[PDB]
C-alpha cells in the first residue's frame, strides 16, 4: 500500500542540540508540497538513538499534526530491546501513526529466531502496521531472506525496508515473497533498480534534499519503465553517493544547512559534516542543481 | 590498576525474566571465593540492553554491596548518545562503582572524532576512572587505536578493553599507549597471550564459569610464565569458542544453569541457547571438568 518516495526525514536541531520545531514544520509541508509520497519521523537519519522517549513522541506528534493526515507517517520505533520496542510502537500507535518502522535489534546480535521472536512478540502486542528494516553494517545482525518470509506470515508485518544494495539478494526476497508484504529499499544508490524490480519505494536519504526529483524517480521506477528509471536517476546519483561520505545522517544535515532549511545541530555522538567534505558536498548541490 | 581476570558477570534471570537476586548475589560471593578479581556489571555479557535505567543501578547496586569492597567493581555505563552515557556513567559513580566501561556508540556510527568527543565529553562531566570498549563486531564502528592512544591523553580514561581479537594490533596498541592507559582484552581465545605481551587483564566471559582457571591464566601471564599462560589457557581453550556458538551471553548463561547455578532466564531480543548447541557444550564442560 505505502508506495513512492518515503523520505526518512532528519530531526532539524538548534546550534545547542535542541530540536528545532519551525524547522522541522516547515519541512514537513515542504515535502508534501515537492510530492513526497510519506514520511518516517524519527528514524536513522532523524537521530533516533540521541533523541528522548519524550522527543520520540513529541516529533511523531509534530510530524502528524503538520501533515494533518495529508500523506501517510510512518513512526520509527525501533529499539535492542523487545519490551523497550512495544512501548514506542504503541506510543507510535495511540498518535495517530500509519505504520512503524523497526530496526533489528543492533549491538545485542539476537539469533534469527530470535529475530523471529522479537518481531512477533511486537506485532501481537500493538495492532500496527509493521515494517522491518534491516541494515547488518549498523546493527551487526543480519535479517536473512528467510527469516523476513516466515515473518511476513504474520498480520501486522506489512513490509520490509531492505537497505543491503545487494539487488540479487533484494530481488531474491521480492520474489520469494510473491507480495505477502512490500519491500522498499535502503538504499538510494541502488533503488531505482530494486524498484525496478518490484520494490514498493525508496525510503531514501536523498529524498531529504531533492523530494520532487526522487519522487518522480520512484514513480516511474515502480511504473517500471527502465530508461526514465536511470535517466532521472542519474541527475541525482552523485547525490546517493556524497550523502555518506560520513555516517549519515551526518552530510545530508549539513546539506540541508547550506540548502538553508536548518541549522547546524547534531547531537553528540554525531558531530557536524567535517570541513574537509564542505566543498565537495556544495558542488554536487550545485550540480544537482539544488542551490 | 585493576588487573587480572575481571568477569562480565551475566545478570540471572528468573524464568519470567526479571532480575534474580538471590542467585546474583551468590555468584558474586562464588566469583570473589573462586579467585575473580574484578566484576564488570552490566556490561554486553550481562544485558545491559535490556535492562531498563532503573534495572541497570539496582543491578550496579547489588553487585557492590555484596562484594563488600573486597574486590572492585567496574560498571556498564555504556551508551550510544552522549548524553545518556554520562546519566549511567554518573549514577555509577554515586552507587560507589571503581571505574566504568563504555562500548563505543553502537549503531549511530559516530566518526572518529565523533568517538573522541564523545568520550571527551564523558570524562569531563563526569569524575570517574573511564574504561573504553571497542568491539567493531556489534557496533558497527571501530575504535582506531589512533583514536585510543589520542584518547589516553584525557586525565580520567584510564583503560581499553579490546575484543578486536586481533593480537599484532593489540600489541601495536600496548607498544603506543607506553603505560598511558590499560588494556584488557575482550577476546578469551586471545586472551592468555594479549596479557603475555603487556595486557592488565582479561574482562572474560569464559570466568563466569571457570573462574578461578582464568584467575589462575591471567596472573601467570601478568607474571609473563609464557608456557605456564600456554599449559594453563590449553585446560579451557576449547571453552572459549563454546561459549560463543551463538551470541554472547547466550551460550554463557546456558552453562551456568547447566552449572545448576542460575534459570533460564534471558531477555528478547535473545532467546535461550538453541537445542542443537546443547549437549556440544555440556560436554565441552564435562570434558573442562566443570561438571
Ligand atoms: N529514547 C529513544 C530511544 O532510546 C532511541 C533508540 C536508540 N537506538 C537507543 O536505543 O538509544
Ligand atoms: N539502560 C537502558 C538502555 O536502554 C540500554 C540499551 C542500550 N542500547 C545498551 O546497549 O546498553
Known sequence: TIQGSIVAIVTPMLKDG????????????????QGTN???????????????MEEHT????????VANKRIPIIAGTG?????????????????GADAALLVTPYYNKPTQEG??????????????????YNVPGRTGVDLSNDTAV???????????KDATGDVPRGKALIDALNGKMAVYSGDDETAWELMLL???????????????????????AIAKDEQQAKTLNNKIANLHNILFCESNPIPVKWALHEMGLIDTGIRL??????????????????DAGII
Open 38 to 52: 510519506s514520511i518516517v519521523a524519527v528514524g536513522t537519519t532523524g537521530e533516533a538513538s540521541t533523541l528522548s
Open 150 to 160: 516466515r515473518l511476513a506470515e504474520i498480520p501486522n508485518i506489512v513490509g520490509i
Open 269 to 286: 555522538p554525531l558531530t557536524p559534516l567535517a570541513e574537509q567534505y564542505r566543498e565537495p558536498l556544495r558542488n554536487a548541490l550545485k
Open 115 to 132: 529475530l523471529y521472536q522479537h518481531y512477533k512478540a511486537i506485532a501481537e502486542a500493538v495492532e500496527l502496521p509493521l515494517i522491518l
Open 79 to 95: 529499539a535492542n530491546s523487545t519490551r523497550e520496542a512495544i512501548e514506542l510502537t504503541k506510543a507510535a500507535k495511540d498518535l
Open 18 to 33: 535542541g530540536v528545532d520545531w519551525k524547522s522541522l514544520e516547515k519541512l514537513v509541508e515542504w515535502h508534501i508540497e
Open 198 to 220: 518490484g520494490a514498493d519505494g525508496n525510503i531514501s536519504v536523498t529524498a531529504n534534499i531533492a523530494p520532487k526529483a526522487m519522487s518522480e524517480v520512484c514513480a516511474v
Open 58 to 65: 513529541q516529533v511523531i506528534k509534530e510530524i502528524i499534526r
